Design a protein around this nucleic acid. Structure first.
Length: 51
DNA sequence: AGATCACGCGCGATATCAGAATCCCGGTGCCGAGGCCGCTCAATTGGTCGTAGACAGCTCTAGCACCGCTTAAACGCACGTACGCGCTGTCC
């Protein structure tokens, strides 16, 4: 699978989250797992609200 | 004078006579949502290099702990007064 969400088994965009973390002036560098973790958390909260 | 029965008055509950507002059921037209299509930009793949972070060794500062005194502060008790709370009436 190409998309990083598919690798992480998520419906939210890991690539977009990584890009925002980088172009958000949050830190000099952004780990590889931070976008995955944040996408998973956002997906969980979205599902929790939508249920 | 006391007890029982009948009648009258007062209070509570149900019904009701109504009528008022809400919810519901149906038909209807709509526009807002879901979906398909095409295009392209942003994400992915591959590779590099460099520094940020991980790890080990050492240092010594600060946290923990312990003891013992002394004494400020908490705890306890009691009297009472004044504040909380309930009841009531009036006016707006």
């Amino acid at each position: 699978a190409k998309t990083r969400s598919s690798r992480a088994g998520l419906q939210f965009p890991v690539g977009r989250v990584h890009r925002l973390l980088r172009k958000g002036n949050y830190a000099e560098r952004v780990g590889a797992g931070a976008p995955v973790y944040l996408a998973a958390v956002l997906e969980y909260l979205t599902a929790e609200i939508l249920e």
